[PDB]
mmCIF file of C-alpha atoms and ligand atoms in Angstrom:
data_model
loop_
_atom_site.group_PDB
_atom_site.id
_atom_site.type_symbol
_atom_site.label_atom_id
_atom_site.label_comp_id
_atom_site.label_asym_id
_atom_site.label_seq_id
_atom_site.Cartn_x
_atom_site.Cartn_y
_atom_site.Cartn_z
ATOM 1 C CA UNK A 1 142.242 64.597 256.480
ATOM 2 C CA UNK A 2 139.583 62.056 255.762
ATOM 3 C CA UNK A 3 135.933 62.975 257.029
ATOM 4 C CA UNK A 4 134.338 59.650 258.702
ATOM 5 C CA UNK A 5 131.214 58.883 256.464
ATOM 6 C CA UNK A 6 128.501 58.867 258.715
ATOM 7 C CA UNK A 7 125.764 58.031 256.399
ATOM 8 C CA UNK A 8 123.040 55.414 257.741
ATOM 9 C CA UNK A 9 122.335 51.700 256.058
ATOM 10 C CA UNK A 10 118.623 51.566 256.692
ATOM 11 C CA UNK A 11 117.340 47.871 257.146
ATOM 12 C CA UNK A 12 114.112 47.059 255.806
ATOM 13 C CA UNK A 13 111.461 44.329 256.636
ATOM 14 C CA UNK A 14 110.441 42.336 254.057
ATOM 15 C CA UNK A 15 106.856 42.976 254.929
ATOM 16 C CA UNK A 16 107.450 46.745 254.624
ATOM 17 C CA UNK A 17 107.126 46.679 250.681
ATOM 18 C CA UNK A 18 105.404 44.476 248.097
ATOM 19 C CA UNK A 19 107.112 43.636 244.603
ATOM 20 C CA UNK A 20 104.548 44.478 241.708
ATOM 21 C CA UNK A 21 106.163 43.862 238.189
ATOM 22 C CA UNK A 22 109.641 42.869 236.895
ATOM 23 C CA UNK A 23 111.174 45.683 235.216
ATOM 24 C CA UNK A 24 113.519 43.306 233.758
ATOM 25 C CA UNK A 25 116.054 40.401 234.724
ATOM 26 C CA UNK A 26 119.041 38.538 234.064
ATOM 27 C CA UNK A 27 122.782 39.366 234.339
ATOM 28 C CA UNK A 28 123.163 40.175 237.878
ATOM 29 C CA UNK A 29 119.353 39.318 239.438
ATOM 30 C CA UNK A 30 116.596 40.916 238.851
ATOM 31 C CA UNK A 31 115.316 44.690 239.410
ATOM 32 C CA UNK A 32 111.280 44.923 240.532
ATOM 33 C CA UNK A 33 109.066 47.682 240.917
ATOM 34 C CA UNK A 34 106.812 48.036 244.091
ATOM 35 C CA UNK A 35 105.872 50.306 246.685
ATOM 36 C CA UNK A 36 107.107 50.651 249.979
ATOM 37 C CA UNK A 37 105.187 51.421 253.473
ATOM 38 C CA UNK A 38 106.763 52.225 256.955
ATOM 39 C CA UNK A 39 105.045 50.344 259.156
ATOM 40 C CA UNK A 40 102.847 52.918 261.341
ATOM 41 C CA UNK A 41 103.602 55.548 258.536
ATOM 42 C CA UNK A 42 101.080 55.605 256.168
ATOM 43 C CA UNK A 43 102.426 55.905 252.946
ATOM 44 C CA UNK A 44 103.527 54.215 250.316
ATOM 45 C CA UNK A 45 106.487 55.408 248.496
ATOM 46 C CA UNK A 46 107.283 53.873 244.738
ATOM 47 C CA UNK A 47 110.584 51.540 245.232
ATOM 48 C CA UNK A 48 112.717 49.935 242.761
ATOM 49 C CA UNK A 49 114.134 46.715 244.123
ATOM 50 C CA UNK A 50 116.944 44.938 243.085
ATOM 51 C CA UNK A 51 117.826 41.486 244.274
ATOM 52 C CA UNK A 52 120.634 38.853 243.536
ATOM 53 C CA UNK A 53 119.185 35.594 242.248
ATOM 54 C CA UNK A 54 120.220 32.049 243.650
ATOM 55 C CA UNK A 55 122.583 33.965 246.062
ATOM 56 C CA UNK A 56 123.528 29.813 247.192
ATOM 57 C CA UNK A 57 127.288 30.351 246.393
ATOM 58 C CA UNK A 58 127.218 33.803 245.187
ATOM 59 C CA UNK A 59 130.145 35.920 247.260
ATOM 60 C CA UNK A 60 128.779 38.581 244.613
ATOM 61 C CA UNK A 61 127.290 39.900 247.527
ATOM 62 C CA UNK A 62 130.719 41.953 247.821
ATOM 63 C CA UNK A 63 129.752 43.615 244.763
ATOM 64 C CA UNK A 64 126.457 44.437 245.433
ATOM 65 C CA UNK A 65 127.173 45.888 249.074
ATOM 66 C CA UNK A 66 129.603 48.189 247.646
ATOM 67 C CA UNK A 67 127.087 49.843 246.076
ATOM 68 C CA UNK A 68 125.045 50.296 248.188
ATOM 69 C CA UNK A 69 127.357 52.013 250.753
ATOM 70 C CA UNK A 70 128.011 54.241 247.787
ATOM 71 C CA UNK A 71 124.556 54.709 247.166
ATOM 72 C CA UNK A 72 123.585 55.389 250.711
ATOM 73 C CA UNK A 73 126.535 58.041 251.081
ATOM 74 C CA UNK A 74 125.399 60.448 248.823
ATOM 75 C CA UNK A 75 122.515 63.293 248.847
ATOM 76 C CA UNK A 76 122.053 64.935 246.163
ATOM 77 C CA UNK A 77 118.625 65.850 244.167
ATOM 78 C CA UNK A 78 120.486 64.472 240.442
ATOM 79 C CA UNK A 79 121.798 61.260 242.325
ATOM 80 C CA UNK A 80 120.063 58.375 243.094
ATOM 81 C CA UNK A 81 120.120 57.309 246.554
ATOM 82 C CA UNK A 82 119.426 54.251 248.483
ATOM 83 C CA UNK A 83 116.614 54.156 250.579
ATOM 84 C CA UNK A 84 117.752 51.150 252.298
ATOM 85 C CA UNK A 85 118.694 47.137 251.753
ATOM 86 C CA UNK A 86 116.660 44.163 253.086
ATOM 87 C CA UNK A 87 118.691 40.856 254.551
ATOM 88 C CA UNK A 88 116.416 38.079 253.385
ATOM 89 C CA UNK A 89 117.452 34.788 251.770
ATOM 90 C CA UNK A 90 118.823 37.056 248.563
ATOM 91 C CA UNK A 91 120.087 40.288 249.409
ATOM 92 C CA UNK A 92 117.726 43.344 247.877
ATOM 93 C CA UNK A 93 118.395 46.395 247.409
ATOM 94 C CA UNK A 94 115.309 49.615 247.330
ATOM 95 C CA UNK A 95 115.803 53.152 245.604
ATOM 96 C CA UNK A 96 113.393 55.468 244.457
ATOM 97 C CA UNK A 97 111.380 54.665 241.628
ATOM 98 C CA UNK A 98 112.317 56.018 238.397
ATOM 99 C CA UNK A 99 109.288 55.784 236.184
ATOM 100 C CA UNK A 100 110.374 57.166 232.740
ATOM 101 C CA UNK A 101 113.782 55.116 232.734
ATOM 102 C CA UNK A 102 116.889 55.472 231.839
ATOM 103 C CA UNK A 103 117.871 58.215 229.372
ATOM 104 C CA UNK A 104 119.338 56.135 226.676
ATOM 105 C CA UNK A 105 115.953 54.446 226.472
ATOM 106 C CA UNK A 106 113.741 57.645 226.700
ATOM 107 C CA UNK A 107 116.035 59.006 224.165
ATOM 108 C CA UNK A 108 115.339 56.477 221.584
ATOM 109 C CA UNK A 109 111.398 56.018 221.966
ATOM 110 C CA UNK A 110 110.260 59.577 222.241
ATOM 111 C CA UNK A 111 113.196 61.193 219.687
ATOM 112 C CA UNK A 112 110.512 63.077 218.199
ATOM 113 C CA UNK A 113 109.214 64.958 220.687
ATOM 114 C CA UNK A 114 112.542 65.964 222.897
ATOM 115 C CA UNK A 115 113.312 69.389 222.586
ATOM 116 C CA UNK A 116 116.181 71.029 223.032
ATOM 117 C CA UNK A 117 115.169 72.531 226.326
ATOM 118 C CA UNK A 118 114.904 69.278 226.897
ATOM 119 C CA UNK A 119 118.256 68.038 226.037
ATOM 120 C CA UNK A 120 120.200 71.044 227.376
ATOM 121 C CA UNK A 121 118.648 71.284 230.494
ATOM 122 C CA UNK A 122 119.814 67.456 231.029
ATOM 123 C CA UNK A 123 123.341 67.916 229.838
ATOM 124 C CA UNK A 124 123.107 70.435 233.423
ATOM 125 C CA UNK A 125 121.446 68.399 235.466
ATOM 126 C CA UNK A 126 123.892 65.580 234.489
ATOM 127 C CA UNK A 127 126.857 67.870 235.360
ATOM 128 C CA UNK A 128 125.101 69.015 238.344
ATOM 129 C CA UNK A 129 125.072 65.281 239.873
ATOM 130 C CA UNK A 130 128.575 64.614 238.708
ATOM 131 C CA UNK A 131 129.729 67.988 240.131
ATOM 132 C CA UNK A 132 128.595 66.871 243.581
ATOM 133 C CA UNK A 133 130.029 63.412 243.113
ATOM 134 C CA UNK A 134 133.962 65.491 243.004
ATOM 135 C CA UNK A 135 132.677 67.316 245.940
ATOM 136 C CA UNK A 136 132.218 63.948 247.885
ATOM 137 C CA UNK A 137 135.468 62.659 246.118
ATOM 138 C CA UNK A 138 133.533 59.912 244.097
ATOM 139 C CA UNK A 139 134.697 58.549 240.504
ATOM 140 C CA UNK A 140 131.951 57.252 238.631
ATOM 141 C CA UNK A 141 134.157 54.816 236.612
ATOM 142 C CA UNK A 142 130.722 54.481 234.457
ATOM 143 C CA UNK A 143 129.014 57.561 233.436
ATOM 144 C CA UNK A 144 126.974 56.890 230.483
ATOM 145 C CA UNK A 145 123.048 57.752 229.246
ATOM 146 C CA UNK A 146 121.875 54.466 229.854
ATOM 147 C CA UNK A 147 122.881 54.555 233.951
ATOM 148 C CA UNK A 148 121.103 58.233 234.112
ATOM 149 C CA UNK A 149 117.524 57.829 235.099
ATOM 150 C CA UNK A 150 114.633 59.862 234.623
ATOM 151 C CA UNK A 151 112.358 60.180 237.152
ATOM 152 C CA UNK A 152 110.653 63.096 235.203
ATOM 153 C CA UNK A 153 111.179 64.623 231.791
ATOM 154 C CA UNK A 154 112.117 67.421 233.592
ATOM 155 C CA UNK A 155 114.335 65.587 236.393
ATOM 156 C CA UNK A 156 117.032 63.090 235.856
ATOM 157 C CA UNK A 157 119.825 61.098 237.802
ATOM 158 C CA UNK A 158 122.677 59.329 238.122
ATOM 159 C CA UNK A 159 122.709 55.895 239.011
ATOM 160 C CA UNK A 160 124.509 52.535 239.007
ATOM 161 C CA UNK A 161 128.059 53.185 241.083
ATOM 162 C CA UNK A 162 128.875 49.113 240.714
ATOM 163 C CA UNK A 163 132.143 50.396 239.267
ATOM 164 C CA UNK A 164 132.219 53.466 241.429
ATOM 165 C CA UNK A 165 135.420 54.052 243.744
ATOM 166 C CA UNK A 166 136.383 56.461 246.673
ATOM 167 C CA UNK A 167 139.434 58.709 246.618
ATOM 168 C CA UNK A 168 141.499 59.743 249.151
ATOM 169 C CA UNK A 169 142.694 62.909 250.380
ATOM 170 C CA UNK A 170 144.096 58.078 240.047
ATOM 171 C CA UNK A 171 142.153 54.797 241.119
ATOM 172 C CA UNK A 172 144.102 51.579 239.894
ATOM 173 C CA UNK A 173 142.135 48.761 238.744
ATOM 174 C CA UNK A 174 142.023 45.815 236.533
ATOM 175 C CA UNK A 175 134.988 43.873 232.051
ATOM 176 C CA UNK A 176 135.053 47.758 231.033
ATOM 177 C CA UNK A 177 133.134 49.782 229.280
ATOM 178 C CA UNK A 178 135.621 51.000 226.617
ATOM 179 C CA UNK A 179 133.856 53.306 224.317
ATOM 180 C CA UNK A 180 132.887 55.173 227.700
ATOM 181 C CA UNK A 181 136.377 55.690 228.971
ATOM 182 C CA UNK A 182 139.492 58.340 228.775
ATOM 183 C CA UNK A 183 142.177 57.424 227.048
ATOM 184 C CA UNK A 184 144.136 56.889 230.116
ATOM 185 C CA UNK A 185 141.615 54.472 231.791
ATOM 186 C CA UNK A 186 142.109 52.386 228.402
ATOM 187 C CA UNK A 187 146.223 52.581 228.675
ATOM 188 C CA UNK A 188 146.953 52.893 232.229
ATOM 189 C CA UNK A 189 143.672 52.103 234.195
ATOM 190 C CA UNK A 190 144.010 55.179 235.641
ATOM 191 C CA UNK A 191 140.635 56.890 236.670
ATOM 192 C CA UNK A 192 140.039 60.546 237.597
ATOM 193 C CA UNK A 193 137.365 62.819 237.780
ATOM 194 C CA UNK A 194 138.522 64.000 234.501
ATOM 195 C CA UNK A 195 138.364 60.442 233.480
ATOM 196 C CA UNK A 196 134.644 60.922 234.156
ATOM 197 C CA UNK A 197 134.529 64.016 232.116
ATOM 198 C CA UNK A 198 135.446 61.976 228.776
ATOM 199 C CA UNK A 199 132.491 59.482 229.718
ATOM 200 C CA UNK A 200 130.165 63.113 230.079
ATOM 201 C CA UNK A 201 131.625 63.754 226.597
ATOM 202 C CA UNK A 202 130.470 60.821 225.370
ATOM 203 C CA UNK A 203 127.140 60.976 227.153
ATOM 204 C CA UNK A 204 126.317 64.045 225.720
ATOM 205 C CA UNK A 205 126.883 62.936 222.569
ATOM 206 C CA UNK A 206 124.785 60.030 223.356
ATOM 207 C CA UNK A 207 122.259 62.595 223.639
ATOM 208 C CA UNK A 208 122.504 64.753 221.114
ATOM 209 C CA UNK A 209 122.606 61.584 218.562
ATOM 210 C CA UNK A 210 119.192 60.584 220.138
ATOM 211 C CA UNK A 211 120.820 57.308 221.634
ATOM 212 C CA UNK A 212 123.049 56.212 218.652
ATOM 213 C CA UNK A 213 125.983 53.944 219.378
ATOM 214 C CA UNK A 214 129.309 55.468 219.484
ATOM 215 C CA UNK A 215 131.625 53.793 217.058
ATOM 216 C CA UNK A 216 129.204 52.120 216.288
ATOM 217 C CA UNK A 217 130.441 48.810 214.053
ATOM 218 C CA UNK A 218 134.190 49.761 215.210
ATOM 219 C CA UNK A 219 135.911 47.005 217.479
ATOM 220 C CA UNK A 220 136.477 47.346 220.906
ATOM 221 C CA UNK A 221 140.292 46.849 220.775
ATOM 222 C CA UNK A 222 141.054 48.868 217.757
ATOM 223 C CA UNK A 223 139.369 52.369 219.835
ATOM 224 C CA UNK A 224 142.799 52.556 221.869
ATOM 225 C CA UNK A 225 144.877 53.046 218.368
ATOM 226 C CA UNK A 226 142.492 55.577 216.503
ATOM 227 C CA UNK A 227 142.039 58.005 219.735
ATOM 228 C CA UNK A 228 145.641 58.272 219.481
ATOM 229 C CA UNK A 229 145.429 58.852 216.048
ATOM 230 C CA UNK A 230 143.198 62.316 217.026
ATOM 231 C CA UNK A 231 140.017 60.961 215.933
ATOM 232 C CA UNK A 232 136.971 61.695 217.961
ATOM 233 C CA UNK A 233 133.111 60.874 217.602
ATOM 234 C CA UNK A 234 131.167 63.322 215.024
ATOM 235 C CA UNK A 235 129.610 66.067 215.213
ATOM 236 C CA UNK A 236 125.711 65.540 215.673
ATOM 237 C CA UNK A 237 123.691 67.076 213.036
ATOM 238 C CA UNK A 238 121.566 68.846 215.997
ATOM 239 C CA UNK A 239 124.387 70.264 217.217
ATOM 240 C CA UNK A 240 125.953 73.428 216.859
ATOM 241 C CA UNK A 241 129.673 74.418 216.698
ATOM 242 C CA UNK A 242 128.632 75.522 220.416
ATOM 243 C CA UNK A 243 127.881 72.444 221.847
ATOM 244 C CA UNK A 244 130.246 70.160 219.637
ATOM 245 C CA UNK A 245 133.329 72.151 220.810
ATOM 246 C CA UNK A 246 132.040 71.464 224.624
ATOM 247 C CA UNK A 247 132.043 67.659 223.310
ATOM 248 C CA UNK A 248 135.309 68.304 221.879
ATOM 249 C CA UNK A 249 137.439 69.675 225.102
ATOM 250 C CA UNK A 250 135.834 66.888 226.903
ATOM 251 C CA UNK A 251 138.035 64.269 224.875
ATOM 252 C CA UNK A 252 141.327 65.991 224.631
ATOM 253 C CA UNK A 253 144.152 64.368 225.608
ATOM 254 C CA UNK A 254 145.708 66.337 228.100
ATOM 255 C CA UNK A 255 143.293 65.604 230.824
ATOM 256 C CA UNK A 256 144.013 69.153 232.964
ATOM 257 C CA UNK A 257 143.020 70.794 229.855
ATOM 258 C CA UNK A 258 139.465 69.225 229.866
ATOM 259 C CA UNK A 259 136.335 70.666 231.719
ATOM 260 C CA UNK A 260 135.444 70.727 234.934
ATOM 261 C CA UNK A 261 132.014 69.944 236.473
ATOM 262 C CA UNK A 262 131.693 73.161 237.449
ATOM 263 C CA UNK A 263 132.021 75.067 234.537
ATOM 264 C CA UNK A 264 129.952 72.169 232.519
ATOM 265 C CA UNK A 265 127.110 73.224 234.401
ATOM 266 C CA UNK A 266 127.729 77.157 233.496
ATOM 267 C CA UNK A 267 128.274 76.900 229.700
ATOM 268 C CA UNK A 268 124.866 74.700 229.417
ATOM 269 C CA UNK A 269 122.885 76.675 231.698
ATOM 270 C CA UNK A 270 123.501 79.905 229.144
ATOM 271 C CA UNK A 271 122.869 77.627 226.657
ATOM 272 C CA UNK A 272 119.591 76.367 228.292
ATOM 273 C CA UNK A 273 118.790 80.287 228.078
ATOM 274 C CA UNK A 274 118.376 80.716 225.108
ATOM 275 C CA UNK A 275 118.190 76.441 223.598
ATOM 276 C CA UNK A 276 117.190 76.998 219.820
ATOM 277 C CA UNK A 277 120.558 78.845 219.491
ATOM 278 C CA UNK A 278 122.541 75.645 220.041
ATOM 279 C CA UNK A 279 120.630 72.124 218.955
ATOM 280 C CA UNK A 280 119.003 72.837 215.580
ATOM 281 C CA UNK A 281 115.846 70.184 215.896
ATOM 282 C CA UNK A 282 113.323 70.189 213.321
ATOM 283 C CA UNK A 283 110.092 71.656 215.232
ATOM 284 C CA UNK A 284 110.886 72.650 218.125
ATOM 285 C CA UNK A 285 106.526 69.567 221.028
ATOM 286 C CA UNK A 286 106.023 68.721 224.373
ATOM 287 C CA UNK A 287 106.571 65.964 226.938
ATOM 288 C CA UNK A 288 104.605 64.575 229.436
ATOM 289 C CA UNK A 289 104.067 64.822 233.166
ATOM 290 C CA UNK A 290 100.630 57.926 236.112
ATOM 291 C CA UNK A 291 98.863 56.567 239.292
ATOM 292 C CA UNK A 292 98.988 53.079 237.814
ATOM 293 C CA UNK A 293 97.392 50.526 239.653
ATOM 294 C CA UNK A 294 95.552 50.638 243.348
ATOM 295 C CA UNK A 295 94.669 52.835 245.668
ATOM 296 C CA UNK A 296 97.400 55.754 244.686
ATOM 297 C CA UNK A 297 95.713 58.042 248.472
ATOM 298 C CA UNK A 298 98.174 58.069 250.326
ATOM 299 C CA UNK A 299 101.229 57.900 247.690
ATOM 300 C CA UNK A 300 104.218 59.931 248.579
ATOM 301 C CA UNK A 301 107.249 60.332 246.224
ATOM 302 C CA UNK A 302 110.597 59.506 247.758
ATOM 303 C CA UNK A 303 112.233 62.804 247.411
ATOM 304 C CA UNK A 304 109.544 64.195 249.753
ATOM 305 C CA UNK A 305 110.091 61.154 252.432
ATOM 306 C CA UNK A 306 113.215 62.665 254.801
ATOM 307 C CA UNK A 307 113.531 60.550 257.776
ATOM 308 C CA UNK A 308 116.578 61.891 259.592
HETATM 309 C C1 QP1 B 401 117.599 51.581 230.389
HETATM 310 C C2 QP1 B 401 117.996 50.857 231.670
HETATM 311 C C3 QP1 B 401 116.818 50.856 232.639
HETATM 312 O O1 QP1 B 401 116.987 50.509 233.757
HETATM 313 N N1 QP1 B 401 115.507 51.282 232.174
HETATM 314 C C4 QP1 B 401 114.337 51.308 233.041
HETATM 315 C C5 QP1 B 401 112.993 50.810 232.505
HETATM 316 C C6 QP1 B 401 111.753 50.839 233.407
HETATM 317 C C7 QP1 B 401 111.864 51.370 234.838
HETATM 318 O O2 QP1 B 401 110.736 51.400 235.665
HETATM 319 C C8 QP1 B 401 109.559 51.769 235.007
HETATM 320 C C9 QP1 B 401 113.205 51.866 235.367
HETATM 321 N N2 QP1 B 401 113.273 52.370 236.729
HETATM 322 C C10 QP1 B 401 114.373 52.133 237.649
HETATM 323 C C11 QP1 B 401 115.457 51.086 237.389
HETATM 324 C C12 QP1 B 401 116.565 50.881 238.367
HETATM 325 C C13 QP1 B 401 117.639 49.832 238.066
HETATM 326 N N3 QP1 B 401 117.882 49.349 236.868
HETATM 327 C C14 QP1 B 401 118.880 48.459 236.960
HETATM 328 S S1 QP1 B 401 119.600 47.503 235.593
HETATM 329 C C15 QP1 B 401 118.578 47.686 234.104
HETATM 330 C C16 QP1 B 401 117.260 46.939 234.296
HETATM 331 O O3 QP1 B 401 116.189 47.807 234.057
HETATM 332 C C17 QP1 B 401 115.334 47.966 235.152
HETATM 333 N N4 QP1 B 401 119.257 48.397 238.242
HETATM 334 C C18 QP1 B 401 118.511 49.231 238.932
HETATM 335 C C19 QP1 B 401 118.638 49.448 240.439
HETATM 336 C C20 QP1 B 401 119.907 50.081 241.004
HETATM 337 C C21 QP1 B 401 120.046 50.301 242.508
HETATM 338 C C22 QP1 B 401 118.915 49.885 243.445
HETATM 339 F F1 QP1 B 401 119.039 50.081 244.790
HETATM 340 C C23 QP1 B 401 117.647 49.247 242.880
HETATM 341 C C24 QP1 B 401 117.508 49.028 241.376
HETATM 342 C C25 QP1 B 401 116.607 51.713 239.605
HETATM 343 C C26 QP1 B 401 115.523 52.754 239.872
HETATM 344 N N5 QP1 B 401 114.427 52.947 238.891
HETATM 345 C C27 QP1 B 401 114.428 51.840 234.464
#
């Protein structure tokens, strides 16, 4: 009872797109910006690519393919999706351009101008992309706000599925990201999509901090001991009883008793209706809408290029 993923791995020539800056290096390789143009298209879409430096004696390359079958299998308009990989020397990989960043950033360097429109209106779109990731079966493993971009104030996505895995028709595994994680994924490894509703819990509180650090000076070994203890992460002085208790139920123990996607979405759209009831934020602003460089004529955003 397993569908057969019939999603398409688009190959790209080199010559189809042209790097423009480094958006920043290191770690793994290094991710560029550029823009991308179908030969005998005419247009040129904004592209983030991400290649794998001195791939010589890599056999990373397993790693980095992974994701991008998982990127490439999934639609969705709060998901980032691959727009295809290109076999040179080092192995690239091209996605949409996200030109605001990632939300943990954007969080930090605009903190006082995000409203709580804003901020609710995320925390949906968030659970909108992660509800459509447990329709297509998909544990995120790594749900935070720094792997959710923003492509506009108004629009954000999920990204970075390195750590994502496939379920069947409770993922075993065995570097983590442990303030992130359920407290089964720290004890038994054991991933669900209610394991990814703890890491929405903590992104949301991410959020609603304006990009502090949870336990923040608190080792990394010494979390597993105090979440048994029945100690979670404060309550945010923005936030209401409302919202806190959502935080709340998402880091409960009993991991049937937590949230699901679908209901995430609910409560924070009726919260979205009606945002100064919930998040308390002193002056409650506005955010902004950015051609850049060269001729920007023909420019064509990638949600609008469907090639089927
Ligand atoms: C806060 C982390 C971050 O990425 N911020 C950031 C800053 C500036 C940007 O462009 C203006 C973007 N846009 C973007 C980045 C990525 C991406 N980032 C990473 S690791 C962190 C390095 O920061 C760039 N990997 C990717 C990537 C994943 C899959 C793929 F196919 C290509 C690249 C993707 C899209 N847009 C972000």
């Amino acid at each position: 009872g397993e569908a057969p993923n019939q999603a398409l791995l688009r190959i790209l020539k080199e010559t189809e797109f042209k790097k423009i800056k480094v958006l920043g290096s290191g770690a793994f390789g290094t991710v560029y910006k550029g823009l991308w143009i179908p030969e005998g298209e005419k247009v040129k879409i904004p592209v983030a690519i991400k290649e794998l430096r001195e791939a010589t004696s890599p056999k990373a390359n397993k790693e980095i393919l992974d994701e991008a079958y998982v990127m490439a299998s999934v639609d969705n308009p709060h998901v980032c999706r691959l727009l295809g990989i290109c076999l040179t020397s080092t192995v690239q990989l091209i996605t949409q351009l996200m030109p605001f960043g990632c939300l943990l950033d954007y969080v930090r360097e605009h903190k006082d101008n995000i409203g709580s429109q804003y901020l609710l209106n995320w925390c949906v779109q968030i659970a909108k992309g992660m509800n459509y990731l447990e329709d297509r079966r998909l544990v995120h493993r790594d749900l935070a706000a720094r792997n959710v971009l923003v492509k506009t104030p108004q629009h954000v996505k999920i990204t970075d599925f390195g750590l994502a895995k496939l379920l069947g028709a409770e993922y075993h595994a065995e570097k983590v990201p442990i303030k992130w994680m359920a407290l089964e994924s720290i004890l038994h490894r054991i991933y669900t999509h209610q394991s990814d509703v703890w890491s929405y819990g903590v992104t949301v509180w991410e959020l609603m901090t304006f990009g502090s650090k949870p336990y923040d000076g608190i080792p990394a070994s010494e979390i597993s001991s105090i979440l048994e203890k029945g100690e979670r992460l404060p309550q945010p002085p923005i936030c209401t009883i409302d919202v806190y208790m959502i935080m709340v139920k998402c880091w409960m123990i009993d991991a049937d008793s937590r949230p699901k996607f679908r209901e995430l979405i609910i409560e924070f759209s009726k919260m979205a209706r009606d945002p100064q009831r919930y998040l308390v934020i002193q002056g409650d602003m506005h955010l902004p809408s950015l051609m850049d460089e060269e001729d920007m004529d023909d420019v064509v955003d990638a949600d609008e290029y469907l090639i089927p």
